[PDB]
Design a protein around this nucleic acid. Structure first.
Lengths: 178, 70
RNA sequence: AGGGCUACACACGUGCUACAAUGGCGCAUACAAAGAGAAGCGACCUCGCGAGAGCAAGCGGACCUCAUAAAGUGCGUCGUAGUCCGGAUUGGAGUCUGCAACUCGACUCCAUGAAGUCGGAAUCGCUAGUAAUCGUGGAUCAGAAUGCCACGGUGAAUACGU
RNA sequence: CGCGGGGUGGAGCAGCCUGGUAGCUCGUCGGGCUCAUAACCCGAAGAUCGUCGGUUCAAAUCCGGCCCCCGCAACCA
RNA sequence: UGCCUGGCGGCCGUAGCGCGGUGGUCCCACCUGACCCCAUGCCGAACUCAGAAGUGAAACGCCGUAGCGCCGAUGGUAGUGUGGGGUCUCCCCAUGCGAGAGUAGGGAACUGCCAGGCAU
RNA sequence: CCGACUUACCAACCCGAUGCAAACUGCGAAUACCGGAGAAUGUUAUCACGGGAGACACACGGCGGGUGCUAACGUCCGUC
RNA sequence: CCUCCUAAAGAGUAACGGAGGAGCACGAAGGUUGGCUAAUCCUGGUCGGACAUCAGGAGGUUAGUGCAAUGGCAUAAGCCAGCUUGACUGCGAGCGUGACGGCGCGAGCAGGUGCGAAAGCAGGUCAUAGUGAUCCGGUGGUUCUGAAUGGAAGGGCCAUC
């Protein structure tokens, strides 16, 4: 995982020293990147479910855990235990390797989106990147029956607070949105 | 490490760098927080004349009458 | 001055282009009349896929030019398949006329490419150079015709009977 | 009971035995007729053939069961 | 005998919570690597496996702390058996029983078991 | 149209106080109830199974409470 | 017929008293093993409102529970995945219980079975509801009888409509 080798070799000392920390798991350490993707229900025949499956497929090769509408209450309606969003809690060291393009030069894709700010990660250092447009692997075809917009990417952190959050996400590199 | 899903993940070795080491990133303005114009450069060539006609090697000083050619 | 006159959901009157195999597709090939033109029409030249571009004779009009009629013919070609018709739409590039082509232009061009497979009830025009069809030219016109006006090709069916 | 018979575009009717097709009429919404209106004529729209399943190029139709009605069934100590 | 971690406890909010401070080969976590058992409605994060260094940070023991939760007297007080009265579904009086809440105040825990380190 | 320099203005969560309950409890007597050990008294009362029944139409009164107008020489139950 | 109260701290308790429901659903919604933890509000967010999903936090059961209500629960009883069919037959110590009919509950025995390394478990469903006495007839089993004898009907016994 070269981003995480960059963090092991270069960033851990940069961050440790500059923030004056005393122990290695006191120091910042970027954890468990997760995603969602929320579908406009699954549709009457489960076709927007297929659309969850190929979009996940775009940046995790797996299958979805697939989250279910536990309660269903107001306006999206019914079933109260049928499939909805598309979560992946990614693999470890490999997930950190994914992190080599997974929110670094994910930029030729980006057109703006509501996340990625060095002010509006939560007051707990936890954040969600809703990307819209798929990263690109280099293989054949670009007819995926596309679901144009997808993927809230919820990065998780050894972070409890504002200061560990902007340790990450900003000057760990890649930069936040300017 | 469950050995039975996830079929690819890494195989180019993640080459991207500038424009030039497979695919693009360019400048320090690599945060791409806007859309696509699809309409600027080369018509806007760095200049504001939008296709004057085919090249002459004369290009005289002032004025004319086209159907008299005198 | 800028919008609007030109909107668009929809219904109606008129003309357009076609639905094909008498045909459509390519090359080659033949014979029109009538017109308009000085601040206009504008060859030949050399470029340009094309529109056009630029250089410039010439014209003052049976002289030059707009301007090469086209369909038709001749051979190849497609083989009834919404196509090799039709090409509207729509993207991009391009030419152009002009204070200015976005609302709202004309035109080239490349790509893509829909409806239409003879059309209820109803309904119009037509007897002869007429009908049908092919193309030409001009007035309005800075530019901007599918229409208007006129021009000529090829050129018919039939009206028994009131 | 057992038997028979029915279960059609909003509504009311066509197709039914080797079957081939969703028809007709009202009601709709637009057209046509006449100087205009009236009615008249007309185009279009409007369905799983109550349900499931078996077959042929063919099931609205023929077969069982489901589900739903209805006629008869002088049947239940 | 003492100090400390851990397993198994007794008892099971005076035991808990917050708050603030402390500790690392003794053990315990996190912890790195997952090849192989095994495992993820997907995910070595979890479960599981191989294991040092890092590290006491987070976790967890420990220590201080009454903010909180909690326990909580004494007295009085309502209610009540029975027995007697005035009357109304209302109390007094006899004598027994006598709360709940609040108050003073207590209160951050005592305790058995084997093992392991350390002190001795 | 976003949002906020800008609170001038509203009532939710929350906070403090205060009251209420048949079908409310983080709390709880008296008494009644079960079983146990012992003292006393009690013509064994009680307890088994047999002969014989009458009975199942009760009201005011204290005590507790439903209905009712905390009406009824009401009504229905519990207790005495 | 079921749940609360009246109903007086055992519990039975009455009224055209007060308030709600049931007349099944069940082939996993049962068993067993193995695992796992809610409502709710807030902080941030691809479009959903922060009020369908996501991560985090606060919360600490206020959710869940096939179907009222009451009790229940975190060993979950709830949520899930495998294997599985103890929704076992014969019995049944002892009892709460009802005038009776009758209803309920149960360790263990014996057999045969499934899960589990295993101790262990399971004789349905977390509990209380989901029903119908006898007669007659009906189908099935039977090592029971089967009017002179042998067989048969018929009847008995058992299973079930």
């Amino acid at each position: 995982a070269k981003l995480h080798d960059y963090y092991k070799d270069e960033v851990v000392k940069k961050l440790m020293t500059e923030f004056n920390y005393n122990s290695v798991m006191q120091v910042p350490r970027v954890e468990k990147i997760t995603l969602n993707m929320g579908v406009g229900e699954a549709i009457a025949d489960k076709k927007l479910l297929d659309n969850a499956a190929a979009d996940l497929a775009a940046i995790s090769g797996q299958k979805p855990l697939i989250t279910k509408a536990r309660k269903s209450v107001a306006g999206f309606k019914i079933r109260q235990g049928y499939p909805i969003g598309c979560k992946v809690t990614l693999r470890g060291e490999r997930m950190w390797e994914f992190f080599e393009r997974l929110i670094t030069i994910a930029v030729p894709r980006i057109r703006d989106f509501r996340g990625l700010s060095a002010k509006s990660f939560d007051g707990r250092g936890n954040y969600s990147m809703g990307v819209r447009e798929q990263i690109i692997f280099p293989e054949i075809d670009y007819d995926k029956v596309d679901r144009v917009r997808g993927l809230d990417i919820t990065i998780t952190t050894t972070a409890k607070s504002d200061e560990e959050g902007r340790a990450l996400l900003a000057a760990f590199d890649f930069p936040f949105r300017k | 490490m469950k050995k039975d899903i996830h079929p690819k993940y890494e195989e180019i070795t993640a080459s991207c760098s500038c424009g030039n080491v497979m695919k693009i990133r360019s400048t320090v303005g690599h945060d791409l927080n806007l859309d696509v114009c699809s309409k600027c450069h080369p018509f806007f060539t760095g200049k504001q004349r939008d296709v004057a006609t085919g090249g002459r090697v004369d290009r005289f000083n002032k004025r004319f009458n086209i159907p008299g050619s005198k």
